[PDB]
From a paper:
On the HIV-1 Env trimer, bNAbs recognize highly conserved epitopes essential for viral entry. One such epitope is a V3 glycan site located at the base of the V3 loop. Here, we report on the identification and detailed characterization of the new anti-HIV-1 bNAb 007 targeting a N332gp120 glycan-independent V3 epitope of the Env trimer.
Fab was added in a greater than 3-fold molar excess to SOSIP trimer, and Fab-Env complexes were then isolated by size-exclusion chromatography (SEC). Structural analysis revealed four trimer classes with either 0, 1, 2, or 3 bound Fabs, with the most populated class being a 3.0 Å single Fab-bound trimer. Interestingly, in gp120 protomers bound by 007, but not in unbound gp120s, a portion of the V1 loop is disordered suggesting that 007 binding destabilizes the V1 loop.
Author numbering:
A (entry chain E), C (entry chain C), E (entry chain A): 34 to 57, 65 to 78, 82 to 138, 147 to 185, 188 to 309, 312 to 323, 323A, 324 to 397, ...
B (entry chain F), D (entry chain D), F (entry chain B): 519 to 546, 570 to 663
């Protein structure tokens, strides 16, 4: 037997590489720079060890989404002239009881196109955006932390599906097992040209517009016994949630400099009503019953499963923070998680709108979302949960979030990047002449 | 036709039928990142082709060599290597003996380079 | 017969690729960053199809010249403080009737290095740069749209020749036919490593400092029958045009901040006269006679060729806008195109000067051209025209332009980029042993 | 010496005299524009070398293969091909038959790769 | 005999190429972005010609150190609001006679977060930073030239070692001769993947924290006979110099905008004392005795070696300017160079501190060094000199510097970049069959 | 083992036994600097491999050629070239004639590429 060199053998090993975008009005997650898409080969007899909690595609996607975000906020208006004293009154014109003292009618002096001239303008500011300084005198929430850019009116925040494709010499292994818990050997592996359309949907406490499980609700945690680890629930059947902003906001353009315009809420045409989201009470209840059923396999059949609302912290982590229609909702999901489980109607979630947005947990970078003209309606899919377990025969689960890598860990759990090692040596009766 | 990495679970005898399939796919925010991935693909490909040329295997997919198979590397017989195992299983077995085999191939061809140089001098 | 593989065959396909620089005080087109130059191979029996109207060399050069233009304007003073209220009077000191009301004496409060100190300065502004707010109050035209980046006085606007060189694996084919209409087969093809020195001369209605036709005037249109397409006339002999600004301007530096300085016209030393361009009446008349004679070939011998002036629109398209000496001229060119053709003296074209320049038709990015000290004289070559025809027995041709790709389409018409396909298979009696 | 692409109008017999002239000319934000053109040239060159390698033609400007010329691709005789046509005319005639020829060359080499591999063990 | 082609021969040519980093809280020289380190091959019988005065490793390192310096100053506060009128009084509280008139107490009107609100603040400014306008009115020296970018307090100025590593196909030859004058053949050549840790210590008139000569003091000049060339002296044993700023500074953060903060000296707690550096009188005298002894070899045994202080010019060239502790010192060093040589005590050098730093001799790009809270003490090594000779039987040597390329020429003198030529053709009796 | 460039001071005969050493180290703001240096290393490596391919020397470190030695390039015999001189000394002597030999090697291979091509047609 003599050493024989084979080039092109089907051998790989785990590797980390820079996957490049591909995608099938400008967008924040630019598809113009992403190369156009085109694919899947089944690998019989191949058992591959996956780990969604040590996957580098999630970490590489987090950097890319953030980088795609702030490079789209570079060319457009920096609202440093908006840090002034605001003479804010209360909007009491046709307000409901729920949304009372939530919008402020703030008047301020604005810079004009002409440097020497001054401009006396007014705008409607949400209570969450202005802080009182001691009509009363206010200022914007983030004026002692940073000056911060108006969200560019022509770029879109809508999630567009993006395909992360491995370069030459690398392959993406896709786990086709339908009951995969994110870690361990996957008996059904296939290699894809690159991943499916993964929408970068920003959300908290609820995975919106994601991918549904094939057979049953999938419970996925790094260590199910560790309460400090978040639990990623995935639904086999979506629960649609209907978002709305009933107010008929009017967008008003204020010329704050040469070539710079600031878009302000003029006046609401009609009555002032609170934003809210609707989840079907029957659909949510049956889904939690399915969640509890698969949640008893890790804690026992006799354990008491209790759902409670968020423990506390920032508004971004205590609320179902999301975006659709251009306005950023912060909905109160205490009605979704309030139940104890033992062995036509709708749920209305009162939401709050915010315009100064800091969303990647970075202090010093705010974005001012301009008002959206008209009424905003929104229909999404609750395709999962991010739960947290409290530290007895009763287990309490509270919605989690904040860390945005968990939102994309639920889409890249079945994918794996490997490096092809095509140089192999094996014995043979060959002998070079 | 199985496709790229289609014979990953096949036996090495059957997976050696499709070396060209894997060989041709080793060569071919979204700016320099995508450009440096292309340069890394070229550099990895060129270093594998350099190794083949050093061992006298340039331009070949199956290259029978003059280095004998040390039984310490693997005591298995040909029947249970080319008909019972896959290339992924084999790579795990001889992962640590890879570098000592590479040096043996490198020095063996270097001896043939001077042996044919001396024979041609006559 | 057996298949045999040849590598290195002289076969090419038409392809689009990124060509790089070559060039044999800084300039706007940064040829210092562009590589140095050095090569003429004639291709006998080669007949290649050229198309100047679908040549990607033109579209790449447009992007490159634009990108080089706005790259030299990044390290330059942004004239944001110049958007103030201007109290302007009319310069009536030694004015001629033609220049009555064109120059305005504008005083304004300007910023200083010290933030808390103001500065009452004055400057002579052209009527085309200031717009009146309703001595009377004015403001710069570039203030409700953008802020002008002042052109750096050290970077030059003089067009120096650049060579666009194809990368490895690509070739540039050069049509050496002297009667090429820019389309169809080219009996005389040659390959170059890259092109002749193509000066990015920026002008409208008149191709200045270009390349001359070898034997006869060449009329090149995408299709003559379509009046919506521009007509690129090329002269076999040049018509020189003498440009001048008789005013003796004084450049006055005004310090508007730490670092940043603003260069303003202070006072004109002596008599004030209108800028103009001179074209010899005899030389222009014979050239239009040659233009008509090769223009009757597409419209019949009995047709009446009438030359009228520009229809209407912006000052950039209705006037022969150009730049030499650092000032941007806008010449009427209505005495040039005024004649009807049936089957020592000079023409003086009154020119107007602007300092706020929107050059590449973009809106929202302007430039302030600082005043040029002294008297500007300029001698150029009219090496072509950009005519437009309008929809009887007579045809009216008016000067066109605006789209600046036509200016460099007149220099890149004979050039073509191809991709070398060196791998070829052919049959031979040879067999592999 | 005609120069680069000088024999483009020559007959294919005469144009094959100067394959090395074209072969050596295929290899050699504004910095990125030049830099991406360099990487494109390298990987375009390497894909053509890889094709020659898998046909057993690596390191050869003219390579003889074991694939017979099917008359369906071109029925013209040997005399009216190497003395009457140019390489540009020829490429346009077999353009649609190029890919099926490329597959035949790849299949003929891996057959030879194993037939020599099997015979070398005797 | 027949030509035989050898690939991989050990042949190199001298070449210039781009070397990259290697490095074993952020720093100005961004070694985090630089690759990690790891290798010593001795080249017997190899005699290579080295030239430290035409070594492109020096010119590349100068560009990189400058480029890394102004790269860490991009995400830092631009002190445009600091150009205001300063009403300055003299700090006379617990002042000493040496420090009389050096520190000034300047009050000024400053911005706040809110644009419409001002801020009456004060700061202690050094006399070298403020210039008087004709309590009295002053303004910062960096205001009729540019605006200073305040040094970010988290980015450190401490020089950490960096390794300049040659790319593939290039080698770095290291001259291991211990008596190398920086020019001519080196009998002991070795190749490295890259160099030792070269700290980019920026200083003038004294090479601090450098590399020591192995056996004797080395005098390396481009040519000794030319007085216009600097003399690079290298010590075999280090002379330690103890730097101190006895003042107990207070760093007072002044919020000058949304985000942006300006750190100012508030009040110094206790006695005011002059900054100074201490060099041992015996250790310096013995070192100058060694410097003279190897300096007589180029000027004769009977010559009189006289050491005088700096001739004149900027404070950066006339003083031993350096930086350690975050403050930039400018020490007199006139007691160091004051002696004539014929064939427990310390030397205290009074130092002056600036906060507005023009570091790379560039004009129009300054930096404000924020005050360091507390008392700064600093111990470093004098490992060389930068002397200048002036055009009798006596020679006068004055300290030089300014050009920072001489500082890193004393570290890269033994290194050399060569380009490997692996293709070689030689005759052999062998013939191709 | 001497290491990279270790045989630089060795004689030409002794330094030609370590060609695999130097061969394998020819291949392996502030991001383009690293990236453009990597692309230049690949381009240089491919240009030297291309030269070997057109001389018939592809995949070989010592390549026997058919070009005779003119002795106008170097009158020294083998004894004083392969046992006294080093490769650095030798390179400085035939540097003038390097491009003359490089053209003869290319010309000889092209003639040989066809004399073998015409031989298979019988
Ligand atoms: C989850 O996905 C759904 C649909 O896949 C998203 O709803 C869609 O959101 C887009 C963007 O806001 C809507 O487009 C807009 O429509 C309005 C009215 O036609 C138009 O005025 C706008 O210019 C824009 O075209 C789209 O209509 C809407 N589809 C629905 C509600 O059925 C939803 O936003 C996603 N949720 C996320 C990303 O959190
Ligand atoms: C067409 O080309 C001609 C020459 O080929 C251009 O005329 C030249 O323009 C340059 C730039 O303005 C002149 O250089 C300047 O000369 C003055 C003389 O006082 C000097 O003070 C400046 O510092 C600068 O060096 C050059 O003299 C001039 N040559 C002639 C003969 O007039 C013309 O501008 C081009 N027309 C275009 C580009 O539209
Ligand atoms: C020459 O090198 C010496 C040491 O090799 C340098 O002295 C060191 O300088 C650093 C930076 O200032 C000191 O670190 C600092 O220490 C203080 C101690 O209170 C701490 O508060 C700071 O946060 C920082 O960590 C270090 O202590 C100091 N070491 C000694 C022994 O003095 C010296 O600065 C260099 N001289 C140059 C570069 O000119
Ligand atoms: C906008 O500016 C106006 C005028 O500068 C402010 O009105 C004055 O405010 C000052 C405050 O000190 C009073 O003393 C004056 O009596 C006010 N009126 C006039 C005519 O000057 C107004 O308060 C500013 N608004 C905001 C929101 O800052
Ligand atoms: C520059 O600013 C000054 C004031 O800062 C202007 O002077 C004022 O002019 C108005 C007339 O519109 C008077 O009512 C004020 O009393 C003036 N203030 C003074 C003199 O302190 C001056 O007009 C400005 N100059 C320009 C050219 O706009
Ligand atoms: C363009 O031509 C006109 C007329 O031919 C020139 O105007 C003459 O200029 C000279 C010198 O300044 C005067 O002596 C004449 O009196 C002018 N004549 C008229 C009718 O105005 C003008 O200078 C020329 N401009 C150029 C060559 O740039
Ligand atoms: C800060 O600004 C105030 C005013 O805004 C200055 O106080 C003025 O001082 C001048 C003397 O030059 C007096 O004539 C004015 O009456 C003052 N105005 C007031 C008190 O409102 C003060 O001097 C400035 N401080 C500094 C340090 O520049
Ligand atoms: C607005 O209403 C809220 C709640 O009723 C109250 O706290 C606040 O003081 C009010 N502000 C004004 C300006 O009326
Ligand atoms: C996931 O499945 C693997 C294999 O069955 C198992 O080892 C691991 O413990 C599971 N993880 C959890 C959190 O249950
Ligand atoms: C959310 O709603 C629940 C029930 O209506 C309530 O207990 C809770 O206070 C609400 N959240 C906040 C932040 O007020
Ligand atoms: C998988 O293994 C079985 C076991 O014999 C074999 O029959 C089959 O061909 C294998 N599949 C592939 C794709 O090699
Ligand atoms: C085979 O390998 C063993 C170690 O695995 C080694 O000791 C022995 O020398 C090797 N035999 C040969 C012939 O190289
Ligand atoms: C100043 O010139 C303008 C035209 O630029 C004219 O409208 C205005 O009447 C003039 N004013 C005078 C002559 O007083
Ligand atoms: C240009 O000339 C060629 C050559 O005769 C011809 O085929 C083509 O139609 C002409 N194009 C136009 C627009 O006349
Ligand atoms: C062009 O064709 C003629 C006639 O066939 C031939 O003699 C000549 O060599 C050809 N030119 C080239 C460059 O091959
Ligand atoms: C303050 O110090 C300066 C020198 O910095 C001096 O010229 C001035 O006279 C001093 N003023 C006093 C002592 O009142
Ligand atoms: C440095 O020493 C070398 C070795 O003798 C010598 O050739 C060279 O001239 C010296 N240079 C100077 C400047 O003395
Ligand atoms: C240096 O030269 C000596 C004498 O010729 C030789 O023995 C030794 O091997 C050489 N060193 C190297 C590294 O070639």
């Amino acid at each position: 037997l003599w050493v024989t060199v084979y080039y092109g053998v089907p051998v790989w090993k785990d590797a980390e590489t820079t996957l490049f975008c591909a995608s099938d009005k400008h967008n924040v997650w630019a598809t113009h720079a992403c190369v156009p898409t085109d694919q899947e080969i089944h690998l019989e007899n191949v058992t591959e060890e996956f780990n969604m909690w040590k996957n580098n595609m999630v970490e590489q996607m987090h950097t890319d989404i953030i980088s795609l975000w702030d490079q789209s906020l570079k060319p457009c208006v920096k609202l440093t002239p908006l840090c002034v004293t605001l003479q804010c009154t209360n909007v009491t014109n046709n307000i409901t009881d729920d949304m009372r003292g939530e919008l402020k009618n703030c008047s301020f002096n604005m810079t004009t196109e002409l440097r020497d001239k001054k401009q006396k303008v007014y705008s409607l500011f949400y209570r969450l955006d202005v802080v009182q300084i001691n009509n009363k005198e206010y200022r914007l929430i983030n004026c002692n932390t940073s000056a911060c850019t108006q969200a560019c009116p022509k770029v879109s925040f809508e999630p567009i599906p993006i395909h992360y494709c491995a370069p030459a010499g690398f392959a993406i292994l896709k786990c086709k097992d339908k009951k995969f818990n994110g870690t361990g050997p996957c008996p059904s592996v296939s290699t894809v040209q690159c991943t499916h359309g993964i929408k970068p949907v920003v959300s908290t406490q609820l995975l919106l517009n994601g991918s549904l499980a094939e057979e049953e609700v999938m419970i996925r945690s790094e260590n199910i016994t560790n309460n400090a680890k978040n639990i990623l629930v995935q639904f086999n059947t979506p629960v649609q949630i209907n978002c709305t902003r009933p107010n008929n906001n009017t967008r008003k353009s204020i010329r704050i400099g040469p070539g710079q315009a600031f878009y302000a809420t003029g006046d609401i045409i009609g009555d002032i009503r609170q934003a809210h989201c609707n989840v079907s009470k029957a659909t949510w209840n049956e889904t939690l019953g399915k969640v509890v059923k698969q949640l008893r396999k890790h804690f026992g059949n006799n354990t008491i499963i209790r759902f409670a609302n968020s423990s506390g912290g920032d508004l971004e982590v205590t609320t179902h923070s999301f975006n659709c229609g251009g306005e950023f909702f912060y909905c109160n999901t205490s009605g979704l998680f309030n139940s104890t489980w033992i062995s036509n109607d709708s749920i209305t979630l009162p939401c709050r709108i915010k315009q100064i947005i800091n969303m990647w947990q970075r202090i010093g970078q705010c974005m001012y979302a301009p008002p959206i003209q008209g009424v905003i309606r929104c229909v999404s899919n609750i395709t999962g949960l991010i739960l947290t377990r409290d530290g007895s025969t009763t287990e309490t689960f509270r919605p989690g979030g904040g860390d945005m890598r968990d939102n994309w860990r639920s889409e890249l759990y079945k994918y794996k990047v490997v490096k092809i090692e095509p140089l192999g040596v094996a014995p043979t009766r060959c002998k070079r002449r | 036709f199985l496709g790229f990495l289609g014979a990953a679970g096949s036996t090495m005898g059957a997976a050696s039928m499709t070396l060209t399939v894997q060989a041709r796919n080793l060569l071919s925010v979204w700016g320099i990142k995508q450009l440096q991935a292309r340069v890394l693909a070229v550099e990895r490909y060129l270093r594998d082709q350099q190794l083949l040329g050093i061992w006298g295997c340039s331009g070949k997919l199956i290259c029978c060599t003059n280095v004998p198979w040390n039984s310490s590397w693997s005591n298995r017989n040909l029947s249970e290597i080319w008909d019972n195992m896959t290339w992924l299983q084999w790579d795990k077995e001889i992962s640590n003996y890879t570098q000592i085999i590479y040096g043996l191939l490198e020095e063996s061809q270097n001896q043939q380079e001077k042996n044919e140089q001396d024979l041609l001098a006559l």
